[PDB]
Amino acid sequence: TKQFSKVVEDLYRYVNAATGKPAPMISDDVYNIVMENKDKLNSAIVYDRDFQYSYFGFKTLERSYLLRINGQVAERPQHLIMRVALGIHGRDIEAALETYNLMSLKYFTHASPTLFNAGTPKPQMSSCFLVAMKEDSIEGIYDTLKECALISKTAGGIGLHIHNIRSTGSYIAGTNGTSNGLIPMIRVFNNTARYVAFALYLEPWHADIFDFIDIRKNHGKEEIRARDLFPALWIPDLFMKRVEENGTWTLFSPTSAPGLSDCYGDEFEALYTRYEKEGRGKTIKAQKLWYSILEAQTETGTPFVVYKDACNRKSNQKNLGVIKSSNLCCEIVEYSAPDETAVCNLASVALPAFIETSEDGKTSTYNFKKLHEIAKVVTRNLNRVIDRNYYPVEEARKSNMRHRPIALGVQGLADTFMLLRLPFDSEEARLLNIQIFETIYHASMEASCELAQKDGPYETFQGSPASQGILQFDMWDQKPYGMWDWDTLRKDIMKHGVRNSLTMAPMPTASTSQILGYNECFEPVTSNMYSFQVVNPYLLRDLVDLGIWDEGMKQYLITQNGSIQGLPNVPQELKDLYKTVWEISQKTIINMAADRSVYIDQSHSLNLFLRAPTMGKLTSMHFYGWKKGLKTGMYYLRTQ
Amino acid sequence: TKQFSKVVEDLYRYVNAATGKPAPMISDDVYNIVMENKDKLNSAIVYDRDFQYSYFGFKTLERSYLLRINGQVAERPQHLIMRVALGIHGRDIEAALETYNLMSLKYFTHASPTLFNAGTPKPQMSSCFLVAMKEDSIEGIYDTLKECALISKTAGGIGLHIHNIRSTGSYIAGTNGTSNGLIPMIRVFNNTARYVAFALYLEPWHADIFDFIDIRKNHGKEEIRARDLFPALWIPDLFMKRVEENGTWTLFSPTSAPGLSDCYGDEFEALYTRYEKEGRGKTIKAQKLWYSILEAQTETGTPFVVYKDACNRKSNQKNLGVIKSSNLCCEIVEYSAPDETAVCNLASVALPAFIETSEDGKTSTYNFKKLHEIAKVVTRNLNRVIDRNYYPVEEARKSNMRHRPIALGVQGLADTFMLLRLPFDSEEARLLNIQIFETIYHASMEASCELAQKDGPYETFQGSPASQGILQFDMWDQKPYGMWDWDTLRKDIMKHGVRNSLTMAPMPTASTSQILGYNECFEPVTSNMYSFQVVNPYLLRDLVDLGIWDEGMKQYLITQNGSIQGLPNVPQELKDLYKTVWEISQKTIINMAADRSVYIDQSHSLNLFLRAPTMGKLTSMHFYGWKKGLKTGMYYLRTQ
Amino acid sequence: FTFNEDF
Amino acid sequence: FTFNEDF
Ligand SMILES: Cc1cn([C@H]2C[C@H](O)[C@@H](COP(=O)(O)OP(=O)(O)OP(=O)(O)O)O2)c(=O)[nH]c1=O
Ligand SMILES: Cc1cn([C@H]2C[C@H](O)[C@@H](COP(=O)(O)OP(=O)(O)OP(=O)(O)O)O2)c(=O)[nH]c1=O
Ligand SMILES: [Mg+2]
Ligand SMILES: [Mg+2]
């Protein structure tokens, strides 16, 4: 239509012809805003920026993001972006226009649900939810089920923790019967998910643990499986110790050993230890469970591994109570309770947008000042999203409004390293990683402090680590790299507060990185060849600058896993620079994750890749991340 | 232990050793009653009556009814009976002692759940529940699901009606998606039933009807089935007309044709007809659906057939609103709503207990006066049960307390006919059937009127048919057979009310008839041979009185379907008297069901038996019951 | 379809 | 089980 206000007209007046029901695609609110500002809004759009995408990147928007009329695309990309900008900012036209420009130029983007839903009548802009199992009763299980069903009407993922449901064989008052345990109850939630993804969180001392970790096994032992949901372990340090030292581990039903999931560290160890001596559970060899874990991971990629004590000891939300899960993708570490369902408010900064080639020659630099700036903008966007969001359930509204947690992420890390000619595993990639995550943390906390000065600190700020001057890297007992002035930031925080309980959680970017044409989040390249036929564009240009690219190359690069090691007409500096993730030591991956993590409020989704997997390599890879103090030891195990 | 008060002591003080939790088997209430009356109670028991059972009848009590300690029977049958008597009557010791004697002598019994649960701490004495689907929304579906889960913690069946859930393809506001329809939602309830029987009720104009009636088909078209639940049709007369006259039938989604399940008879016809002309649905040939129905029944025995208009036009509960289902077994016709879940309060009168052989010779008579009397006792028991019952959900408490419906049944009809030497199909069996059901209706309504004089009429009595002098047989436009004075009864009812909205619903007796050694309810014998090796005892004695019984008979009777037609050394009077249900015309079965039904408040479970089934026989058998004014046209189709 | 038969 | 390896 080439006129934003007109496509807003069409989308707003849309009527479902099949039924005769008016089916508005835009909220009253955002429609009134567009009309009262139609000239400023319409002439702000730079339609030239629609060509600033790729083919497969534009096709991702076209296939799934751009609003449609009669199955016909009704929005151009600039319209979608301006819709999202207004959906976020409402009446703040100048804030909207800035977000429009920065997003359209590709400095950052917002998570899928924001892009779908910003500026529509039910604007559910948040990626995921962390649900507490409400109580160990039919009532609690079915109240929780209803809530998960309600959450799934507008979709976005669910992380659900079930440490409190009594295991198989457990006694039930007023009946001859005993509990069926977890698996049967998991099958109820699976079925609801199917009717209307799910991650399930459990502590490894739970007596149904062996069955739980095989939830995704292929060999179908009938009604003891549930493929559809993802198991995630919530691992206490004691577990890992016992495995390392080859000792024992005791399985309990939470009704015979209550409170285990309501404490952590030493208080857990003491309470767990007392329960073991009172013969309340069933003892086995720690390594028997360990073995079963790694078999499940080797075969299914699951369960995920997130360290409970690391999460809780190093969370600014520790004044709230004990955090009992993470989320679907293993980056969110936010408190939940029967009446508080934690929400993920996500957006990603495009890291390559800050590469500048300044003062002639091959020299490119990285603009940390512009990064600091854009991270400040996204932090403010994300706060606007807390408030303007549609909450599918009241538990989620209560959680978000009370603690106001935010999750800033990144995309194009690998892209950034490659454009700057840095091998992922170099000392220069290692330093740039630290600096980026430092500036993003400093900027988000600075912007959040500004917000606290304007609107007050979040309700639960007092008594929090941040209020006592304890920032994230402090909880790792480190000094910050020191590109930014932390003293002054910390001073202002203790004086004024921050608006957000939490700020950082580098997530799986997935389809929001496909649109901008960057590699997923903070990962390296899985292949120098994706899909059709597309080779790594940075690699492709280097092979064309040596004049060696042709068809006697496209074949090779295909039937060779997208790898370039072992190509004879290829300089060593190129091999170093375009290692596949299978070709990078996972020790380097974990080291670099440990570096950035001192600057991460929450966690981050650490996918791990093992070429020639053995139970010994996996065990070592796990204990390495664990001794590194990682919160998320592992998202998916990818293999072979 | 031979001492009731002592076994009450043991059961009350029971402790679950595995857990250390005190697990009382008796309520505080009933325990205090036993102790304060221990001498009267203990010396009332006649332990000689434990031998007044059969082997397989005692074994039914032993296997499943008698309370147990460490998996060891802790109650003798007289203890169980005295427990039930006290559970029903509480402080009314003289009422308890009467029920004790009458039950122990085997004049009547109570439904399974009463026998299990009477006098225990959660005394859930009611057989089944009729649940309304609360609303066409995720909220309503999941509130309904929770309620069904709650009901299943203490078991007893569920009849659930789902006429209000929108069908496959139906529009949903705020989404690109359309509804999955009924089958997927049925699979959610199936799974809950499995986790924690179910009958499902639907009107045949619902657009998912074809899939609904095949819910139990063997050939497993994956996730479109749900074997576990029973489909039951709620058939409007218009449907049957259209099939008979070979015309059309229109399928609607209740959102495009709302209110159809909230009217009946002519008002339905008018509203259905208007919707058909407004082109709101999809027209097909009535006989296409009909055909599909009979294929499903022939193959699975389901769906059940209950006539909506017959049920509603002839219900004393019609002042409440429109009745939208029956129950699991197809005898209950009671109103339900989102906040009122109808309850089945069941007990069966043992019909053979009234056969008397008076003034020498072969002459036995039937004591209708003693029948009238015992029916009066059971009516009062059943009212005590309304009040002393534990309700698993509030919807059910509200329903029972407000309208106080009761369901008296029978067992040993066939037994009665055979002991009196009457062929099931004789004019004398036809008259005795009418007389029995007349006296039971007269007695229950008389006792209920007495109760209304003592405690007031039920809350919804005014504006009801009964309050305008319209009794059940009146609604069939018949004169009562007239063994009892109806004028005087009707007069007292209009003056004083009745305590119960409803009184009669001859049900499947099942395991409560196995204990007393009688044939199921109002059915004839399926075989003259059950199970081991037991021949019909009345048949067995007649073959021994001709001296022909041996092993060259036990073989025959086994490999011959338990039939005696086509045995040469067997008199014609015997063949007539011991016809198998396969050998009795189903026309006679339906005629006799139509006779008693003028005296039935609710409905009765009419199982039908077809020897050499054809689509034509089944169609005829259906239309015959339908033109007979039957409420329940068919419970299960048994075949072959 | 046949309505009126011996069953 | 072996904790300390080349991965
Ligand atoms: C009723 C029921 C419960 N359960 C599980 C669900 C919960 O995890 C647990 C408790 O159910 P509850 O509904 O809490 O049962 P209850 O109230 O009788 O509790 P208690 O035993 O303490 O007296 O048992 C089943 O697995 N199957 C069942 O049929
Ligand atoms: C959300 C959802 C609903 N349904 C069904 C359940 C109900 O029968 C029906 C309505 O769901 P509702 O929860 O009532 O959806 P809604 O509030 O958006 O209602 P409406 O369309 O009128 O605006 O759709 C599905 O089958 N699958 C789904 O994912
Ligand atoms: Mg409980
Ligand atoms: Mg709705």
PDB file of C-alpha atoms in Angstrom, chain B residues 310-489:
ATOM      1  CA  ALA B 310     -39.105 -38.128  26.138  1.00  0.00           C
ATOM      2  CA  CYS B 311     -36.697 -37.381  29.048  1.00  0.00           C
ATOM      3  CA  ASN B 312     -37.622 -33.727  29.317  1.00  0.00           C
ATOM      4  CA  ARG B 313     -41.307 -33.836  28.532  1.00  0.00           C
ATOM      5  CA  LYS B 314     -41.779 -36.606  31.097  1.00  0.00           C
ATOM      6  CA  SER B 315     -39.485 -35.348  33.881  1.00  0.00           C
ATOM      7  CA  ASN B 316     -40.801 -34.008  37.184  1.00  0.00           C
ATOM      8  CA  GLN B 317     -37.601 -31.884  37.150  1.00  0.00           C
ATOM      9  CA  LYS B 318     -38.758 -29.894  34.102  1.00  0.00           C
ATOM     10  CA  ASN B 319     -39.360 -26.719  36.192  1.00  0.00           C
ATOM     11  CA  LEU B 320     -35.529 -26.611  36.679  1.00  0.00           C
ATOM     12  CA  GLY B 321     -34.616 -26.114  33.023  1.00  0.00           C
ATOM     13  CA  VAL B 322     -33.637 -28.513  30.258  1.00  0.00           C
ATOM     14  CA  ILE B 323     -31.989 -31.827  31.113  1.00  0.00           C
ATOM     15  CA  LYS B 324     -28.914 -32.318  28.907  1.00  0.00           C
ATOM     16  CA  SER B 325     -27.797 -35.847  29.679  1.00  0.00           C
ATOM     17  CA  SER B 326     -28.267 -39.069  31.448  1.00  0.00           C
ATOM     18  CA  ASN B 327     -25.519 -40.924  33.256  1.00  0.00           C
ATOM     19  CA  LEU B 328     -22.961 -43.660  32.719  1.00  0.00           C
ATOM     20  CA  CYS B 329     -25.601 -46.452  32.834  1.00  0.00           C
ATOM     21  CA  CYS B 330     -28.532 -44.583  31.185  1.00  0.00           C
ATOM     22  CA  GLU B 331     -31.077 -44.630  34.055  1.00  0.00           C
ATOM     23  CA  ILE B 332     -30.555 -41.206  35.658  1.00  0.00           C
ATOM     24  CA  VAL B 333     -32.506 -38.269  34.209  1.00  0.00           C
ATOM     25  CA  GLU B 334     -31.581 -35.334  36.391  1.00  0.00           C
ATOM     26  CA  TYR B 335     -30.868 -31.730  35.720  1.00  0.00           C
ATOM     27  CA  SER B 336     -27.363 -30.329  35.564  1.00  0.00           C
ATOM     28  CA  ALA B 337     -25.800 -26.942  34.976  1.00  0.00           C
ATOM     29  CA  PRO B 338     -22.307 -25.357  35.291  1.00  0.00           C
ATOM     30  CA  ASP B 339     -22.903 -25.044  39.083  1.00  0.00           C
ATOM     31  CA  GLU B 340     -25.058 -28.138  39.715  1.00  0.00           C
ATOM     32  CA  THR B 341     -23.741 -31.602  39.227  1.00  0.00           C
ATOM     33  CA  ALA B 342     -26.537 -34.156  39.487  1.00  0.00           C
ATOM     34  CA  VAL B 343     -25.936 -37.093  41.840  1.00  0.00           C
ATOM     35  CA  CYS B 344     -27.233 -40.717  41.656  1.00  0.00           C
ATOM     36  CA  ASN B 345     -28.396 -42.028  45.008  1.00  0.00           C
ATOM     37  CA  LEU B 346     -28.937 -45.729  44.367  1.00  0.00           C
ATOM     38  CA  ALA B 347     -30.347 -48.823  46.088  1.00  0.00           C
ATOM     39  CA  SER B 348     -32.000 -51.996  44.866  1.00  0.00           C
ATOM     40  CA  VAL B 349     -34.992 -53.904  46.164  1.00  0.00           C
ATOM     41  CA  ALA B 350     -34.598 -57.721  45.982  1.00  0.00           C
ATOM     42  CA  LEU B 351     -37.778 -58.792  44.225  1.00  0.00           C
ATOM     43  CA  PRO B 352     -37.688 -62.565  45.061  1.00  0.00           C
ATOM     44  CA  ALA B 353     -37.699 -61.858  48.846  1.00  0.00           C
ATOM     45  CA  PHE B 354     -41.464 -61.268  48.537  1.00  0.00           C
ATOM     46  CA  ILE B 355     -42.455 -64.635  47.038  1.00  0.00           C
ATOM     47  CA  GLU B 356     -44.574 -66.557  49.550  1.00  0.00           C
ATOM     48  CA  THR B 357     -45.847 -70.101  49.277  1.00  0.00           C
ATOM     49  CA  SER B 358     -49.209 -69.842  51.161  1.00  0.00           C
ATOM     50  CA  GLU B 359     -51.947 -72.533  51.934  1.00  0.00           C
ATOM     51  CA  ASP B 360     -50.235 -75.842  50.855  1.00  0.00           C
ATOM     52  CA  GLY B 361     -49.349 -77.282  47.417  1.00  0.00           C
ATOM     53  CA  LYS B 362     -47.433 -75.759  44.496  1.00  0.00           C
ATOM     54  CA  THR B 363     -49.082 -72.338  44.985  1.00  0.00           C
ATOM     55  CA  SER B 364     -46.741 -69.452  45.689  1.00  0.00           C
ATOM     56  CA  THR B 365     -47.930 -65.851  45.830  1.00  0.00           C
ATOM     57  CA  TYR B 366     -46.303 -62.434  45.721  1.00  0.00           C
ATOM     58  CA  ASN B 367     -46.489 -60.199  48.779  1.00  0.00           C
ATOM     59  CA  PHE B 368     -47.095 -56.714  47.425  1.00  0.00           C
ATOM     60  CA  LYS B 369     -47.812 -55.293  50.902  1.00  0.00           C
ATOM     61  CA  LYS B 370     -44.332 -56.317  52.153  1.00  0.00           C
ATOM     62  CA  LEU B 371     -42.829 -54.906  48.923  1.00  0.00           C
ATOM     63  CA  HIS B 372     -44.647 -51.606  49.466  1.00  0.00           C
ATOM     64  CA  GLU B 373     -43.223 -51.620  52.991  1.00  0.00           C
ATOM     65  CA  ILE B 374     -39.591 -52.365  52.130  1.00  0.00           C
ATOM     66  CA  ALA B 375     -39.647 -49.759  49.299  1.00  0.00           C
ATOM     67  CA  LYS B 376     -40.758 -47.232  51.966  1.00  0.00           C
ATOM     68  CA  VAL B 377     -37.655 -48.183  54.089  1.00  0.00           C
ATOM     69  CA  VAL B 378     -35.216 -47.809  51.175  1.00  0.00           C
ATOM     70  CA  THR B 379     -36.764 -44.436  50.213  1.00  0.00           C
ATOM     71  CA  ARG B 380     -35.978 -43.224  53.732  1.00  0.00           C
ATOM     72  CA  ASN B 381     -32.470 -44.693  53.644  1.00  0.00           C
ATOM     73  CA  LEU B 382     -31.826 -42.915  50.383  1.00  0.00           C
ATOM     74  CA  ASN B 383     -32.929 -39.580  51.887  1.00  0.00           C
ATOM     75  CA  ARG B 384     -30.580 -40.166  54.835  1.00  0.00           C
ATOM     76  CA  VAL B 385     -27.803 -40.727  52.272  1.00  0.00           C
ATOM     77  CA  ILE B 386     -28.465 -37.357  50.593  1.00  0.00           C
ATOM     78  CA  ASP B 387     -27.724 -35.631  53.890  1.00  0.00           C
ATOM     79  CA  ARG B 388     -24.931 -37.727  55.351  1.00  0.00           C
ATOM     80  CA  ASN B 389     -23.056 -38.083  52.081  1.00  0.00           C
ATOM     81  CA  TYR B 390     -19.572 -36.707  51.442  1.00  0.00           C
ATOM     82  CA  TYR B 391     -19.633 -34.619  48.280  1.00  0.00           C
ATOM     83  CA  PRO B 392     -16.350 -34.587  46.319  1.00  0.00           C
ATOM     84  CA  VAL B 393     -17.262 -31.239  44.664  1.00  0.00           C
ATOM     85  CA  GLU B 394     -19.534 -28.344  45.636  1.00  0.00           C
ATOM     86  CA  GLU B 395     -21.612 -28.556  42.355  1.00  0.00           C
ATOM     87  CA  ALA B 396     -22.784 -31.974  43.529  1.00  0.00           C
ATOM     88  CA  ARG B 397     -23.695 -30.855  47.061  1.00  0.00           C
ATOM     89  CA  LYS B 398     -25.714 -27.952  45.651  1.00  0.00           C
ATOM     90  CA  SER B 399     -27.587 -30.243  43.243  1.00  0.00           C
ATOM     91  CA  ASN B 400     -28.481 -32.989  45.785  1.00  0.00           C
ATOM     92  CA  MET B 401     -29.521 -30.620  48.566  1.00  0.00           C
ATOM     93  CA  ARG B 402     -31.711 -28.469  46.336  1.00  0.00           C
ATOM     94  CA  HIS B 403     -33.850 -31.123  44.515  1.00  0.00           C
ATOM     95  CA  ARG B 404     -33.149 -34.270  46.580  1.00  0.00           C
ATOM     96  CA  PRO B 405     -33.549 -36.851  43.794  1.00  0.00           C
ATOM     97  CA  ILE B 406     -33.464 -40.548  44.670  1.00  0.00           C
ATOM     98  CA  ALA B 407     -33.108 -43.683  42.549  1.00  0.00           C
ATOM     99  CA  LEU B 408     -34.746 -46.904  43.724  1.00  0.00           C
ATOM    100  CA  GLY B 409     -34.066 -49.986  41.619  1.00  0.00           C
ATOM    101  CA  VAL B 410     -34.693 -53.681  41.582  1.00  0.00           C
ATOM    102  CA  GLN B 411     -32.865 -56.921  41.239  1.00  0.00           C
ATOM    103  CA  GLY B 412     -33.971 -60.513  40.634  1.00  0.00           C
ATOM    104  CA  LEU B 413     -36.917 -59.829  38.255  1.00  0.00           C
ATOM    105  CA  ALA B 414     -36.026 -62.843  36.105  1.00  0.00           C
ATOM    106  CA  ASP B 415     -35.483 -64.869  39.348  1.00  0.00           C
ATOM    107  CA  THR B 416     -38.943 -63.793  40.527  1.00  0.00           C
ATOM    108  CA  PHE B 417     -40.638 -64.834  37.278  1.00  0.00           C
ATOM    109  CA  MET B 418     -38.849 -68.243  37.272  1.00  0.00           C
ATOM    110  CA  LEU B 419     -39.622 -69.050  40.923  1.00  0.00           C
ATOM    111  CA  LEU B 420     -43.282 -68.279  40.235  1.00  0.00           C
ATOM    112  CA  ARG B 421     -43.020 -70.479  37.109  1.00  0.00           C
ATOM    113  CA  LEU B 422     -43.852 -67.577  34.755  1.00  0.00           C
ATOM    114  CA  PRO B 423     -42.233 -67.343  31.282  1.00  0.00           C
ATOM    115  CA  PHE B 424     -40.694 -63.888  30.808  1.00  0.00           C
ATOM    116  CA  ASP B 425     -42.970 -63.452  27.776  1.00  0.00           C
ATOM    117  CA  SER B 426     -46.218 -64.604  29.431  1.00  0.00           C
ATOM    118  CA  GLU B 427     -49.314 -62.525  30.202  1.00  0.00           C
ATOM    119  CA  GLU B 428     -48.636 -63.315  33.890  1.00  0.00           C
ATOM    120  CA  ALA B 429     -45.047 -62.030  33.769  1.00  0.00           C
ATOM    121  CA  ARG B 430     -46.429 -58.910  31.977  1.00  0.00           C
ATOM    122  CA  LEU B 431     -48.966 -58.258  34.772  1.00  0.00           C
ATOM    123  CA  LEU B 432     -46.590 -58.964  37.674  1.00  0.00           C
ATOM    124  CA  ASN B 433     -44.075 -56.477  36.116  1.00  0.00           C
ATOM    125  CA  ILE B 434     -46.712 -53.733  36.063  1.00  0.00           C
ATOM    126  CA  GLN B 435     -47.801 -54.448  39.644  1.00  0.00           C
ATOM    127  CA  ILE B 436     -44.328 -54.508  41.215  1.00  0.00           C
ATOM    128  CA  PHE B 437     -43.328 -51.196  39.556  1.00  0.00           C
ATOM    129  CA  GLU B 438     -46.632 -49.680  40.524  1.00  0.00           C
ATOM    130  CA  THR B 439     -46.264 -50.619  44.156  1.00  0.00           C
ATOM    131  CA  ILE B 440     -42.615 -49.422  44.306  1.00  0.00           C
ATOM    132  CA  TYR B 441     -43.622 -46.074  42.787  1.00  0.00           C
ATOM    133  CA  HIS B 442     -46.633 -45.689  45.061  1.00  0.00           C
ATOM    134  CA  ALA B 443     -44.569 -46.678  48.133  1.00  0.00           C
ATOM    135  CA  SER B 444     -41.574 -44.413  47.342  1.00  0.00           C
ATOM    136  CA  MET B 445     -43.836 -41.419  46.642  1.00  0.00           C
ATOM    137  CA  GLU B 446     -45.885 -42.165  49.784  1.00  0.00           C
ATOM    138  CA  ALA B 447     -42.752 -42.394  51.976  1.00  0.00           C
ATOM    139  CA  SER B 448     -41.358 -39.261  50.321  1.00  0.00           C
ATOM    140  CA  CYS B 449     -44.632 -37.388  51.120  1.00  0.00           C
ATOM    141  CA  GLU B 450     -44.381 -38.495  54.762  1.00  0.00           C
ATOM    142  CA  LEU B 451     -40.872 -37.037  54.712  1.00  0.00           C
ATOM    143  CA  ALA B 452     -42.154 -33.757  53.189  1.00  0.00           C
ATOM    144  CA  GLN B 453     -44.639 -33.513  56.079  1.00  0.00           C
ATOM    145  CA  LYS B 454     -41.777 -33.955  58.621  1.00  0.00           C
ATOM    146  CA  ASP B 455     -39.058 -31.756  57.048  1.00  0.00           C
ATOM    147  CA  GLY B 456     -40.734 -29.702  54.306  1.00  0.00           C
ATOM    148  CA  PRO B 457     -40.799 -30.350  50.537  1.00  0.00           C
ATOM    149  CA  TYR B 458     -37.589 -30.130  48.469  1.00  0.00           C
ATOM    150  CA  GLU B 459     -36.614 -26.513  47.572  1.00  0.00           C
ATOM    151  CA  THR B 460     -37.818 -26.688  43.973  1.00  0.00           C
ATOM    152  CA  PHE B 461     -41.113 -28.526  44.587  1.00  0.00           C
ATOM    153  CA  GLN B 462     -43.382 -25.574  43.715  1.00  0.00           C
ATOM    154  CA  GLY B 463     -44.088 -25.190  40.020  1.00  0.00           C
ATOM    155  CA  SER B 464     -43.269 -28.860  39.473  1.00  0.00           C
ATOM    156  CA  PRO B 465     -45.563 -31.367  37.700  1.00  0.00           C
ATOM    157  CA  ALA B 466     -46.043 -33.321  40.957  1.00  0.00           C
ATOM    158  CA  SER B 467     -47.244 -30.141  42.695  1.00  0.00           C
ATOM    159  CA  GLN B 468     -49.951 -29.718  40.035  1.00  0.00           C
ATOM    160  CA  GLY B 469     -51.023 -33.326  40.623  1.00  0.00           C
ATOM    161  CA  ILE B 470     -49.188 -34.589  37.563  1.00  0.00           C
ATOM    162  CA  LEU B 471     -47.517 -37.864  38.475  1.00  0.00           C
ATOM    163  CA  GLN B 472     -45.282 -39.987  36.198  1.00  0.00           C
ATOM    164  CA  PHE B 473     -47.991 -42.196  34.540  1.00  0.00           C
ATOM    165  CA  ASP B 474     -50.061 -39.066  33.931  1.00  0.00           C
ATOM    166  CA  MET B 475     -47.221 -37.819  31.701  1.00  0.00           C
ATOM    167  CA  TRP B 476     -47.541 -40.995  29.689  1.00  0.00           C
ATOM    168  CA  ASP B 477     -51.337 -40.219  29.425  1.00  0.00           C
ATOM    169  CA  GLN B 478     -52.265 -43.480  31.144  1.00  0.00           C
ATOM    170  CA  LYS B 479     -54.384 -44.611  34.023  1.00  0.00           C
ATOM    171  CA  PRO B 480     -52.365 -46.447  36.662  1.00  0.00           C
ATOM    172  CA  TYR B 481     -52.979 -50.170  36.989  1.00  0.00           C
ATOM    173  CA  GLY B 482     -54.752 -49.308  40.279  1.00  0.00           C
ATOM    174  CA  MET B 483     -53.599 -51.810  42.913  1.00  0.00           C
ATOM    175  CA  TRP B 484     -52.821 -48.778  45.133  1.00  0.00           C
ATOM    176  CA  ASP B 485     -54.945 -45.759  45.905  1.00  0.00           C
ATOM    177  CA  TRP B 486     -53.448 -43.016  43.731  1.00  0.00           C
ATOM    178  CA  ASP B 487     -56.188 -40.449  44.420  1.00  0.00           C
ATOM    179  CA  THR B 488     -55.320 -40.294  48.104  1.00  0.00           C
ATOM    180  CA  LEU B 489     -51.564 -40.239  47.396  1.00  0.00           C
TER     181      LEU B 489
END
